[PDB]
Amino acid sequence: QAVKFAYWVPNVSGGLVVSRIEQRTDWGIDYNRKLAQLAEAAGFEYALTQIRFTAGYGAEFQHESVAFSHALLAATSQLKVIAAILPGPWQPALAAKQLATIDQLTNGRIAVNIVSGWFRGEFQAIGEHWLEHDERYRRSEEFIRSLRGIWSQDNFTFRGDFYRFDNYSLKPKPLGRPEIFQGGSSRAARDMAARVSDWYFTNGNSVEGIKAQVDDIRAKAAANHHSVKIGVNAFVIARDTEEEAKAVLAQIIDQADPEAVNAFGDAAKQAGRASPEGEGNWAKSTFEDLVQYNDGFKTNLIGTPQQIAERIVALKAVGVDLVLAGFLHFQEEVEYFGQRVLPLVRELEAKAQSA
Amino acid sequence: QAVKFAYWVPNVSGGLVVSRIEQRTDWGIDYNRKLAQLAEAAGFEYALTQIRFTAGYGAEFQHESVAFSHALLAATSQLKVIAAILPGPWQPALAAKQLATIDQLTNGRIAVNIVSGWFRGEFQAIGEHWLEHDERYRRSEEFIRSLRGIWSQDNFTFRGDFYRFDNYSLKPKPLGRPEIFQGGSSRAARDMAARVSDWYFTNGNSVEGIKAQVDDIRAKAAANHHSVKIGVNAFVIARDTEEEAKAVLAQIIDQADPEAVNAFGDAAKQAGRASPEGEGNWAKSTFEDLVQYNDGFKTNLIGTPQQIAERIVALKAVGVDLVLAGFLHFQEEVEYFGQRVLPLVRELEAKAQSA
Amino acid sequence: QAVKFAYWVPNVSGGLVVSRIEQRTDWGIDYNRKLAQLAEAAGFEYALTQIRFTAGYGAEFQHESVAFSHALLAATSQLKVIAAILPGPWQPALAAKQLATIDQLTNGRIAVNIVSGWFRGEFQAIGEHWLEHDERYRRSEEFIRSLRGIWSQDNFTFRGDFYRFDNYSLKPKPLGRPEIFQGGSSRAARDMAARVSDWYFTNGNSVEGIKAQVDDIRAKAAANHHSVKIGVNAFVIARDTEEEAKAVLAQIIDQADPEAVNAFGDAAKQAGRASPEGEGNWAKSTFEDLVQYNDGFKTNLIGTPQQIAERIVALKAVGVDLVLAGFLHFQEEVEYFGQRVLPLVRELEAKAQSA
Amino acid sequence: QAVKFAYWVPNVSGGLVVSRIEQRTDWGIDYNRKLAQLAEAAGFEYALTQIRFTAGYGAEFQHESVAFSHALLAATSQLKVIAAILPGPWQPALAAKQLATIDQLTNGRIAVNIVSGWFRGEFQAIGEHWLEHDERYRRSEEFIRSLRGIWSQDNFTFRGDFYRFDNYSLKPKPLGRPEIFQGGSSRAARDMAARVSDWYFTNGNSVEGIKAQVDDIRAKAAANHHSVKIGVNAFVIARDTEEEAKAVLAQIIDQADPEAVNAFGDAAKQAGRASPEGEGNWAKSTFEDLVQYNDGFKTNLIGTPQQIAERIVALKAVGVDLVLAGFLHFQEEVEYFGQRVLPLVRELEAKAQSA
Numbered sequence A, B, C, D: 001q002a003v004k005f006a007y008w009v010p011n012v013s014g015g016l017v018v019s020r021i022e023q024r025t026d027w028g029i030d031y032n033r034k035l036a037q038l039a040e041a042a043g044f045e046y047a048l049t050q051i052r053f054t055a056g057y058g059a060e061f062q063h064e065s066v067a068f069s070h071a072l073l074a075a076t077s078q079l080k081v082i083a084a085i086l087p088g089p090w091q092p093a094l095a096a097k098q099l100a101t102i103d104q105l106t107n108g109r110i111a112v113n114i115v116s117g118w119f120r121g122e123f124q125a126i127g128e129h130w131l132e133h134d135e136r137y138r139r140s141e142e143f144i145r146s147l148r149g150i151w152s153q154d155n156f157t158f159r160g161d162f163y164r165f166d167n168y169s170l171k172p173k174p175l176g177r178p179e180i181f182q183g184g185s186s187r188a189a190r191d192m193a194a195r196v197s198d199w200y201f202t203n204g205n206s207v208e209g210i211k212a213q214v215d216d217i218r219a220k221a222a223a224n225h226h227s228v229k230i231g232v233n234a235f236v237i238a239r240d241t242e243e244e245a246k247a248v249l250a251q252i253i254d255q256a257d258p259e260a261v262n263a264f265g266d267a268a269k270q271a272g273r274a275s276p277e278g279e280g281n282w283a284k285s286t287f288e289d290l291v292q293y294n295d296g297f298k299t300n301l302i303g304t305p306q307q308i309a310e311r312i313v314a315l316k317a318v319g320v321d322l323v324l325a326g327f328l329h330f331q332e333e334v335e336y337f338g339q340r341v342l343p344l345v346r347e348l349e350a351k352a353q354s355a
């Protein structure tokens, strides 16, 4: 019932914007250990670590998602860290066993974000074939069923089109039950979430755009007798005045790296625009939307703490269970969010309950 | 020129013997962090972490090799940790990037042991096809060429029979040059080491058995203009008296687990016995040899510290550059080795220098 | 420089339309042997088989394209027969060797039509992964380069992303140089034709639509220093009067099987509509277009013999080198074409030549 | 039951021996059409067409097995023709459909010989990975189960480690039930034959060597409740005097091409010698044995017609159901076998029946 919060780990060297603007944010482990500790102290339940094999959207350097996640877990106590994984260059036997060992070493705090892929050139560079849009989701669904089965069954057998297991016994299994997240917003993504995943993570959007996705998932999940929760990306710019927050947004966009934005935008046509419906990630993103590379400005958590808290509660009303927050200057703004924004959300929630 | 020492990480729940004998050894992270610190204090330069996906040779539980290596590096300062990797369920793009990130996080202290595989049933359980003996080495050599090329250049291209890369740029690369080890003793293994590897690791053997491998590698490496060093497995039983060490050895063997040894021995026929020459790992192993699952008793580092030190220097004279030590009670025997055996080795080397 | 003619082999039940109308057409070898002999006598240079692995509704039975082509060549003397091949369920080593042997047995009269695929459900049923639209063309281009190299040289080596060859020597090679045709009309198809194919076969279309494809191919092929010819599908309804030919067309469409048409149109969305440009086979086909399953009515070769001859010559004037003809009643209409239509084309061509 | 007879189709340019001796045998279709007709008239029930993709054992040129088998069936009326297929470069969906169409065109007379592979260099040349010996039989068994299922059921589903099918309906199916033969003599081969195949074809051998294989197959097949028949290769040299037949054998061997024989012997080490038991095809073949490349001289059908007929009947007594005959001068020796040897076998069988 209370809304949950995650933050994007800036393990990619350009932060969370495609922009030349000065940021007090770094992609190295030293910066990120302290940020994970600040996020835990601020009240964030999850950190989300993105997966790249090569540079895109202005991230010339990227730390590998699973090892980096392990290091963040080792530096924290209660924080849960979601390691992103792309089927193809990743296989599920290795993923299940590596995640299970990290879970055993971190008191049960690792999770996974299965992402089905859009950056074709990256796959080509690393010798992976490029499956059709919905076919990438068929494979991701077999990957998810494989993870859950390996972790839950003494002797797991799975006779898939992409993956096979035959009486496979993983030991040790995870300490508890790792949560499986997935990223993407196409019909194929919503279908998979309503079947196998614990969480559907989606790009930023208007309230109406989010409600449309939630309503489809809820109906499908109910018919499948499956439980799934909803998280939405938001690039949060909280400042003491609304004018200052809008001025920061304008600086970010004014300083956009246009060659990086356009190259990202071209590659992103292999996500939602390439699905049979032509709907999903980046299908309707302008140059200015792309400057936050998961459409995070659209969620409009930009203004005063009070405006942002009221907007978060309005997202709860259409079925959002978690806000996935990106920031410009991560350490100071995560701390500010915990001191100034999150307590206002909790007060609004207490007042709603007592009525 | 000084001989180097590695120890086997007991990340598999049966320790380093296929036996019911009581051992003060454990496979969990708590035991292994302390063990790694003691090993570093004792003068071991490397720890070697074995790779399993499911139980064999008496190891019902096994921690995943790379994440466990990451954790041991996080708990130490100068120790180098070698993570074992099996091509097939591992792919080189992910290995290259995950190892590069761990390298960056650990001040350049991770290495890799490419092992080409023998446990067919394990591959079948996780959906991997079983290549012919020498073909597994063909694949491993492509895997090693990919790791080395990815780590050393931008725009790496490789048009292999097993792996493809196309203008691939990994960032960040490792801090320096990670060492590539490999395990196996067949002709295919020796040929691969003489072409692409930094270290050839081999099973325990007599001095003459080791000499025959080194001489073959030396000639082949010279013809390729390639440098490779030699490490040999030895199960070290050092006691204050020779009689006590021999009694321990007999206790380990007398308490051998026959189901596990039979099952291991049958599976191990897919290593040296299955090569075109019929030579390599386990091709000549009796039931008693198999109780140490890399033929470690054959190296005969079993006796007083003085006998062991002399035997180590004798191995050096046939071209052994590193002794890879297994133990029964890891923490206490690593400490004893550093206090009682290693200094005798260093004295012998110093006396040989002045002569 | 004379325009060439092919006919579609009705090796799929239901003929060349998705309609319940009575057809004096059959898919068996007896009807098709006689039809091939009639087509050779009528002046057709080629027969084009189609490739299916499964189908529903009236298209319920399909003879395998290569072995059926071999049988048709065995029943004829001069006719060339083009065997359709889909990369994926077909591999290029077997295709090259099987076609070379058939070429040797048939006096050099076999050709191949490389088709890159649109029917996703058929691939899934036979265990094949569904690659993205342009990726299927990347694979088809490697397939074609493989056929051409294997057939033309010993020691053929190819280091593809999809296919590898290592000093492969096929013996015997074909008697002559088999022509490579390809089917498809997207940008990816045109790019491939301008690089590697002898013939670009495309769906039916207006003169304007054909000319736009020819102009793009001609520019690209010139820059590649590559020669490629153009063939266009047309469903030919030649009758003594224009009114009767139009009545037959209305009858075909009026008796269309609506469920079959809709199921075909839904699956065909994986062709042109799924390409990045949204253009290619079936991207703009209405219900009535889909009744001829390669848009054959659009080419408007429906009317008197004189009208049809003038329209064929008009297609030649925009770069069409070959008309690929479908018919309702194959045997009798092939005979009528050779007696009533083809001679008018030749007369028109002769009269143009006298100027 | 009356013993059945097959002959090897000389679809390979060196005939059935690795020798420079002058042979009145040709690999082209004209010689082979007349040969198949003579064999049919002589009383051979089957022809067997070997599969190569590149030159081995002196076969500089090789016609493709399936298309050549189709052409031989087209030249005959009752002869059954067995096309050899190697899983790997062949896939089962295509094999099933192509064979079914040929079966429909030839009145149900096509069969298949599934061979699991020994010629590693050929696979490497055509881009195929080299599976371990027993794993090749694992794949071949899935291939056989797929053929059998596709041919016999609509909506065939098969969830293999090598092949997948999902509700696949092949139409048309064969006219009846095609026979599945397999070649190979290792434990893996015998185990496969005892589970899925109609015929086990084996290399030439002594009576005792054959009986040891039959006895193992019989016990295994009885435990599986499976029916399988036995065929044995024999290189038949029938002459009016024993002295003449022996002189011919000596001439073949004396004119052996020793570079070809040794190169074949080396490649053949990947058959029986590479199996876990070290037993199977070519494991015990001397230089002289290898001159007939399936050990055909060992069966000793070399002598007068009377001697050969008695030795055939003696093979029946250890469970041989079919003799698979090679010859030096094919057309003339097939005609002679039918005039002079086969009638003696029939008289001996008639005399045994009346006792």
Ligand SMILES: Cc1cc2nc3c(=O)[nH]c(=O)nc-3n(C[C@H](O)[C@H](O)[C@H](O)COP(=O)(O)O)c2cc1C
Pocket (backbone or CB within 6 Å): A049, A050, A051, A052, A084, A086, A115, A116, A117, A118, A119, A182, A183, A184, A185, A186, A187, A188, A189, A201, A202, A203, A233, A270, A271, A272, A273, A275, A279, A280, A281, A282, A294, A324
């Ligand atoms: C919150 C979120 C996080 C994501 N993280 C990643 C990532 O780290 N790497 C990646 O390649 N794709 C990532 N994706 C995109 C997925 O690959 C997604 O499957 C792909 O864009 C196809 O999206 P679609 O289903 O909307 O067409 C993410 C998507 C979302 C919504």
Ligand SMILES: Cc1cc2nc3c(=O)[nH]c(=O)nc-3n(C[C@H](O)[C@H](O)[C@H](O)COP(=O)(O)O)c2cc1C
Pocket (backbone or CB within 6 Å): B049, B050, B051, B052, B084, B086, B115, B116, B117, B118, B119, B182, B183, B184, B185, B186, B187, B188, B189, B201, B202, B203, B233, B270, B271, B272, B273, B275, B279, B280, B281, B282, B294, B324
């Ligand atoms: C010191 C050493 C360590 C090894 N570690 C492993 C391991 O952790 N996992 C594994 O499957 N194989 C391991 N192997 C065996 C390899 O997989 C080897 O390639 C296989 O046994 C074939 O050996 P051969 O070349 O002597 O036939 C190791 C071998 C040696 C000598």
Ligand SMILES: Cc1cc2nc3c(=O)[nH]c(=O)nc-3n(C[C@H](O)[C@H](O)[C@H](O)COP(=O)(O)O)c2cc1C
Pocket (backbone or CB within 6 Å): C049, C050, C051, C052, C084, C086, C115, C116, C117, C118, C119, C182, C183, C184, C185, C186, C187, C188, C189, C201, C202, C203, C233, C270, C271, C272, C273, C275, C279, C280, C281, C282, C294, C324
């Ligand atoms: C003349 C012609 C014949 C074709 N024949 C076949 C066929 O026999 N089987 C098949 O699956 N596809 C066939 N196709 C379609 C191809 O699979 C084509 O590559 C696919 O529809 C993608 O088309 P696009 O490039 O316009 O998107 C044919 C296409 C044309 C133009």
Ligand SMILES: Cc1cc2nc3c(=O)[nH]c(=O)nc-3n(C[C@H](O)[C@H](O)[C@H](O)COP(=O)(O)O)c2cc1C
Pocket (backbone or CB within 6 Å): D049, D050, D051, D052, D084, D086, D115, D116, D117, D118, D119, D133, D182, D183, D184, D185, D186, D187, D188, D189, D201, D202, D203, D233, D270, D271, D272, D273, D275, D279, D280, D281, D282, D294, D324
């Ligand atoms: C009668 C017979 C015919 C065979 N024909 C072929 C063939 O045409 N092509 C081929 O590559 N192998 C052929 N083989 C050999 C098979 O590939 C066999 O599976 C391989 O040699 C392994 O044999 P093994 O099971 O005795 O080790 C044939 C074997 C026999 C006994």
Ligand SMILES: [Cl-]
Pocket (backbone or CB within 6 Å): A185, A202, A203, A204, A205, A280, A281, A282, A295
């Ligand atoms: Cl979206």
Ligand SMILES: [Cl-]
Pocket (backbone or CB within 6 Å): B185, B202, B203, B204, B205, B280, B281, B282
């Ligand atoms: Cl060894």
Ligand SMILES: [Cl-]
Pocket (backbone or CB within 6 Å): C185, C202, C203, C204, C205, C280, C281, C282, C295
């Ligand atoms: Cl079109």
Ligand SMILES: [Cl-]
Pocket (backbone or CB within 6 Å): D185, D202, D203, D204, D205, D280, D281, D282
């Ligand atoms: Cl044999």
